[PDB]
Design a binder for this molecule. Sequence first.
Ligand SMILES: [Mg+2]
Ligand SMILES: [Mg+2]
Ligand SMILES: [Zn+2]
Ligand SMILES: [Zn+2]
Lengths: 446, 446
Amino acid sequence: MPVLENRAAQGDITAPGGARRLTGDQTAALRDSLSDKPAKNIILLIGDGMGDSEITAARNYAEGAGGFFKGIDALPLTGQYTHYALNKKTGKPDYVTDSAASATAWSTGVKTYNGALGVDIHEKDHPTILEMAKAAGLATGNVSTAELQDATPAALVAHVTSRKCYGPSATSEKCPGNALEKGGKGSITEQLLNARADVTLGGGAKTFAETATAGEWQGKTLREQAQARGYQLVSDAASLNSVTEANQQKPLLGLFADGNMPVRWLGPKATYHGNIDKPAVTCTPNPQRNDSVPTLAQMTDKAIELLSKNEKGFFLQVEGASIDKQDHAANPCGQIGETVDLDEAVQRALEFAKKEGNTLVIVTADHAHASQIVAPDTKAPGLTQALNTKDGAVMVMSYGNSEEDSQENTGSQLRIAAYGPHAANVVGLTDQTDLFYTMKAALGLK
Amino acid sequence: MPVLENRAAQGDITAPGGARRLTGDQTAALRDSLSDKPAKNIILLIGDGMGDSEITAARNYAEGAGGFFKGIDALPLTGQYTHYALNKKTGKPDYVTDSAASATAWSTGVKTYNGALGVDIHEKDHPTILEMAKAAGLATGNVSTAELQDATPAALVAHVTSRKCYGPSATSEKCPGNALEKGGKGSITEQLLNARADVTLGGGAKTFAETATAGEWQGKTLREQAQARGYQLVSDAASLNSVTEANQQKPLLGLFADGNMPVRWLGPKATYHGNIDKPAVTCTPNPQRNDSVPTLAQMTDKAIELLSKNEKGFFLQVEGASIDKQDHAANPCGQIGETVDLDEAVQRALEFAKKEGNTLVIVTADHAHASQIVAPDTKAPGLTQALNTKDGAVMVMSYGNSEEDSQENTGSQLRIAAYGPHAANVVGLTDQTDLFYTMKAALGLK
Ligand SMILES: [Mg+2]
Ligand SMILES: [Mg+2]
Ligand SMILES: [Zn+2]
Ligand SMILES: [Zn+2]
């Protein structure tokens, strides 16, 4: 099964056929990409708010318009999937979902209301793909650059009526029914400790400081509970590399930040008429990213190394998180840098899958965002910025869907791409809930 | 080779698996969609400004979120393609293209500057896929709901430095080098007459009223010249149905409007805070669309009927045009209605292809547009409107990339889907220029 080695413009863009990305007929290579054999492992890479526009913007900037992302763009089977949510009251569609409902959709196979984690419109719990995988004896990994309590990584191990129920404090106010002290299953973080995936890596260390309002570890901090539960705590790249085993006896928990991990690139926020008033921006590497802080690619690599030892196979979800946060913050550089980050991760996952032969790798997003690539002389009503691309040209980015700073999400259907056994199930129009069923089946979960 | 009969939500959206579009594993069906055998015919359907977002909004409104367009969504092989243009001066990429440069890129295989038709950055002409097809003896069709002098349909038959050179008048001012009177090849319209496709159907009748500044037909109106050249002129549905033959000896020319043909659906323009201040809109059929005016579907059906008689095969380009004009005009209803129109056309094309077995059907857009599906309570900086979907829910549309009314184009990569011999060449990431090469090769043009 081949990966697209190179789909960059073959030559002189200005010349006939120079802009081509193909060098010949693809029928044969596609036929070699079709396999219904079982997938031993599954690696799901989620780019936060990374719809087609975000991908085009990051490529234009980092690789040039005729460029090619070695990871993100190298997946051969591609399609578009819908991700609408449901209105909790009426049960009718809610055309624009949040991170929480979408994450739930692919992690359980059931649509839900915005803000829900692991439950349907009736607040009924439904087992996630991770729980199912774990129950079947597979190894499981949940990796993210955001806070572990955030919608994407949280959805695999928590079942709460509101995504805001991070720890004890918020839960009692926002999710009384899930509140431990009220006989509920606990907050997001508590449920995460209970779920016991073999490898969990991310930010969100802050909430681990809260103390349990009830149970065996009542009075202890969630951090203290984790140690007591048998978890290996790691807070930096060095200690992470030191890890040699991660299992149900010694589950791994990497907390590398109080909240979200540091952004890759720094750059100014988009502003009114910024493409006109301000000069073109050139993004710059964040000094605080640190050699101490593991990158999404490193965490992905360590995760695969450890999960790999499980003879039965594994399920790993990886999230290039800061993308949509920077998209909300109308910050081009942060957004684009987070897509480059993801791409490096997708490469590590593709290398492993390629050599292993039985791994299904899927790269997609939870929902779409606000960013639009517009003409450079554009006089847009919202926030804009001009960027200096690898092509040595100017690209203007617009965020015009919200007045309240935070650029909202959108409902456009977006790209889903895959490689490996069963990847054919992402081609054409599909629904985000199909993704749950594809992974379940590919993995033979039953 | 199968078409997706149904990818609608299988059942109850609120229940587990109810929102699924798949009913089983697609590996086998995909294997049956792969064929490198030769394509006898090619039918290319272009939705003007019909990116993924436009497709999602038109589905939500006309079919419901869990709906399925029988045409547009039924194509099995899908991917995403880039359509960046080039800056005439520097030769560097111009991230947001217009309809002229994009049309030229798929019709000739060479990238050009915005505004050009059938020429590269150096103003050098390059032969179009239609000219090449005709030269090889295949029948050729050029159908559009727009004015025949507009960028998309014009690009197949004209070679001018500016898309504005409609007829003699504009050409002398805008394109002196193409100006007939100055020894040039002539305006868009004149060159169209010269190209002599077997079937040309659309609007733009107004310009045929101009008189030739030179040549054999100097002093005669372009309409008069057409008659004199041997063309069959048709201006309404009835006369169009009367046509039984269309060939090189009796080429067909249907001019059903002075400009663009009538929009299917009427509705109010999007406005500032319109989703808040104004009530939800329900689009209404346009009374002036007329039983006298053939629909894009009908024109597609007639064109396939006539082109069909050529033993050697045919190439047909069809354009659901009023879509981006209505997108520019921030008019949801017009835009959406144009997408439904196209869908009917794609259906007609897909039935023929399915039965014929050697026809490659491709559906895609020239470039992306402004439309974004946003939460209903959105307070966006631009124009917005709330619509009453088939789901009996509200969907809000936002146009916020321009202040100067006309909502500009965007540079996001968008969907390209196909069915038949060689459709595998649209899967994954490709460039709009690859489309020219795929068609040339499938058709074996040489
Ligand atoms: Mg998230
Ligand atoms: Mg056009
Ligand atoms: Zn998100
Ligand atoms: Zn267009």
